[PDB]
Structures are given as C-alpha cells and as structure tokens.
Design a protein around this ligand. Structure first.
Ligand SMILES: *[C@@H]1O[C@H](CO)[C@@H](O[C@@H]2O[C@H](CO)[C@@H](O[C@H]3O[C@H](CO[C@H]4O[C@H](CO)[C@@H](O)[C@H](O)[C@@H]4O)[C@@H](O)[C@H](O[C@H]4O[C@H](CO)[C@@H](O)[C@H](O)[C@@H]4O)[C@@H]3O)[C@H](O)[C@H]2NC(C)=O)[C@H](O)[C@H]1NC(C)=O
Lengths: 48, 49
C-alpha cells in the first residue's frame, strides 16, 4: 500500500501495489508545472 | 539508484554556478545511439558517466 523502490532487475510477479506509481505522479507534476509556466523551480526532498 | 549515488553532484548547483542536465541510459544496452545523438544535438561536451 506504500510506494517502495522497485529494483529493475527483480523478476518477482506475485505482488500488487495500490499506491499510485510515482512515474505517473511526476508526469502529472510536470504537466502542472508546464501549465503554470515556470522557469526556475526548486525541488526540496526529505528522504533520499 | 545512481541518483542516490550522486546526491552531492545533484545538489551542487545550490553551492555554485554550475548548470546540470541529467539523462538516463535506456534499459537496452545497445540503445545508446539515439541518446548519444542528443549529445550531438545539445552540443554538450562535458559528460559524466
Ligand atoms: C504499464 O506500465 C508500462 C511501463 O511503464 C507503461 O508504459 C509506458 O506508458 C507511458 C504512458 O502511459 C508511456 O509514455 C510516454 O512516452 C511518449 C513518447 O516517448 C516517445 O518519446 C521518448 C523520448 O525519450 C522515448 O523514450 C519513447 O520511447 C518514445 O520515443 C511521450 O510522448 C509521453 O508523453 C505523453 O505523456 C506526457 C504526460 O505528461 C505529456 O507531457 C506528453 O506531451 C504526451 O502527452 C510519455 O512520456 C511510455 O512510453 C510507456 N513505456 C515505457 C516506460 O517503457 C504502460 O502505459 C502501463 N499501463 C498499461 C499497459 O495500461
């Protein structure tokens, strides 16, 4: 139910996730930024 | 995981005037030819691998 870091070389296939994938969330955030038409943004991240 | 490995290099535009453009290798090993074509399109000559 929480997003975890997916290892790309893992081949397990007996799991599902219900948190939205952060690729699509980052695409939505990029679309929102392009809609508001910024030029100089600041990304502040808490955990690595 | 490599963005974890280069946290200080990513955050270094806060310290200095360095401008940074970050690109990802494709999953296929031989598909570097379109990506490297962007290197000839953006005229970028200082690449960190
Ligand atoms: C299950 O998971 C799959 C794995 O991620 C999903 O496949 C991926 O889907 C996304 C969207 O659903 C695909 O998205 C985008 O790529 C196109 C084209 O990329 C073209 O340009 C790239 C340039 O580097 C190349 O790398 C590509 O190979 C290709 O040359 C973009 O045009 C898209 O943008 C569209 O979406 C954004 C949203 O913000 C807009 O801004 C754009 O203007 C346009 O509206 C996407 O970025 C992705 O290609 C695809 N494959 C991967 C990651 O390998 C799959 O969708 C998912 N769901 C199922 C099956 O239901």
């Amino acid at each position: 139910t929480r997003w975890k870091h997916q290892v790309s070389d893992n081949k397990d296939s007996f799991y599902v996730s219900l948190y939205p994938d952060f690729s699509s969330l980052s695409r939505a955030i990029l679309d929102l930024v392009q809609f508001f038409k910024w030029k100089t943004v600041t990304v502040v991240y808490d955990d690595s | 995981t490599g963005l974890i490995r280069l946290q200080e290099l990513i955050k270094a535009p806060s310290r200095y005037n360095l401008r940074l453009k970050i690109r990802q290798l494709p999953a296929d090993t031989k598909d570097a030819k379109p990506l490297l074509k962007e290197m000839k399109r953006g005229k970028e000559f200082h690449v960190i691998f």
